[PDB]
Design a protein around this ligand. Structure first.
Ligand SMILES: O=C1N[C@@H](CC2CCCCC2)C(=O)N1c1cncc(F)c1
Ligand SMILES: O=C1N[C@@H](CC2CCCCC2)C(=O)N1c1cncc(F)c1
Lengths: 305, 305
């Protein structure tokens, strides 16, 4: 037992990280088969940053201007192309460490692990959620651009995120691995509004189930509610509306604990209306929304890769 | 910017995990050079668990009884020896994936990453602290025994923890890699007192510095304190006493922020006496004590491996 914010083991991803330098800018790239993926703003300079014309900037570049280094190994670049906000550098060697992999565009509210890297070297790994407003609350310093987020199922790495930028509010924005930003963001140095954010209701409920499984049970009450009544409360507290699809994905946790989903909603309603009264749940003094139902089941069942 | 509970990248450790089977018990082992390390309780059965005579149990075993498997490849066991609470199985092949490594016995209050494994396969990675009472608050299910904790400095993995057991209270106990338990614990199925835990004061201060660096500064106040006055408050709230050695190791964070260590102690004093008033710090509604001053500097400066 116990319940931790757990990341995926990062070894399969560590073997794909490279350094990419173009001009004076160095950031990280992802080396899969014979292609290196990285943020296209590696080709900018400080004068460019307010509104780069990336097509014009890339036209001034040739293959030999992109310096790609995998540990101490220098890679030979034999082609380059821009796809949305990512650059695809074709290299003459396939990465011998390429895992089985897929590219996925995740939905808001899903979670993934981030391997934070600088100069192509891994620094740390942590778990985080794609917020409903398509930002992430990461830990990224200058030089972390090109760090990737991912999930692992059996032997297959699903890459879902590449880091591009920090907004002036201090939250983080990036793309899928086809270079499409999550959310409204663009890769330029402008103030950019992120949506109203909300709390991921189905994840809070999953975590409350995780709490019960671990014996944190003080918040269970004598009440139930309806989906309609619960969602009136969710709206008041800026929680995402709960749908029957969410109730369905919580099915396995309801079965394990024997607590019906709408009964757990009534416990959550009471926590929202009354607070925690200085108590804690799974070591947290607020309602945690960065565990999906799948995460809770995995961590509670011991799934390996 | 941003501050996350970050684990070390786990790849160097993933390549050392094997499965060890003795009789009907399977758990994890650590394969370094030509030695496999695992918890000695792999040799027990359920009749044994209340107070195993490990010497007598091991005498009934020979090399060929220890089944050691690395993914698909079987290893050949050519010697065995019990050191404290760990078994050392000599194998005829040096692990080709052996990183540069050291065995370290850590101090309470220090942190490390855990690679949770089942059947020799990695499941997840998370960061945690050795509590002042020599337990850890992990996430471990049946079969996780032999999972290890570690730190990395440049290219060198310092192994500091091997997981052995879950106490009846749901916290976790284990050994250094010489098989010596942290704390008073023994490897038998008995209720065992862990004794009073305290909050790691120097770590809370480090995290308050992390907060200021990231722009959470609402808790800074107009007050200062003395080491003696602060420690009266520390004692009242079950915080470890702060020593000048602790103040010394906070020096770099004090210099970076311009906030004297005793001024930050007066902010913590006010938080302990008045609580957080429904506010958060770095996403948390309580005072976090699982980041060491070294952890904060590393994460805020982007140290890689
Ligand atoms: O390293 C960089 N470089 C810019 C890229 C940014 C891309 C769009 C044009 C303007 C520059 C950035 O946002 N960061 C960064 C990311 N995460 C955390 C940080 F602290 C900084
Ligand atoms: O898998 C086992 N096996 C016993 C070993 C234990 C060793 C000492 C004699 C009594 C048995 C155990 O404590 N766990 C476990 C660990 N962490 C989280 C869990 F949920 C269970």
């Amino acid at each position: 037992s116990g319940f931790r914010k757990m990341a995926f083991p990062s070894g399969k991803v560590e073997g794909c990280m490279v350094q990419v330098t173009c001009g004076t800018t160095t950031l990280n790239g992802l080396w899969l088969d014979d292609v290196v993926y990285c943020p296209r703003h590696v080709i900018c300079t400080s004068e460019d940053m307010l509104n780069p014309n990336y097509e014009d900037l890339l036209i001034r570049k040739s293959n030999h201007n992109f310096l790609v280094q995998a540990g101490n190994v220098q890679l030979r670049v034999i082609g380059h192309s821009m796809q949305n906000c990512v650059l695809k550098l074709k290299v003459d060697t396939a990465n011998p460490k390429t895992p089985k992999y897929k590219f996925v565009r995740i939905q808001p509210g899903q979670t993934f692990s981030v391997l934070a890297c600088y100069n192509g070297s891994p620094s740390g790994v942590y778990q985080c959620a794609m917020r409903p407003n398509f930002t992430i609350k990461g830990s990224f310093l200058n030089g972390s651009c090109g760090s990737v987020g991912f999930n692992i199922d059996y032997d297959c790495v699903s890459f879902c995120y590449m880091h591009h930028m920090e907004l002036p509010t201090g939250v983080h924005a990036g793309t899928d691995l086809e270079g499409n930003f999550y959310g409204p963001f663009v890769d330029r140095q402008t103030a950019q509004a992120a949506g109203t954010d909300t709390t991921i209701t189905v994840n809070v409920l999953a975590w409350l189930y995780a709490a019960v499984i671990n014996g944190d049970r003080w918040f269970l009450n004598r009440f139930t509610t309806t989906l309609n009544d619960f969602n009136l409360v969710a709206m008041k507290y800026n929680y995402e509306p709960l749908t029957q699809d969410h109730v369905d994905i919580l099915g396995p946790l309801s079965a394990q604990t024997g607590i019906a989903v709408l009964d757990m909603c009534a416990s959550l309603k009471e926590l929202l209306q009354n607070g925690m009264n200085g108590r804690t749940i799974l070591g947290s003094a607020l309602l945690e929304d960065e565990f999906t139902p799948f995460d809770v089941v995995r961590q509670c069942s011991g799934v390996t890769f």
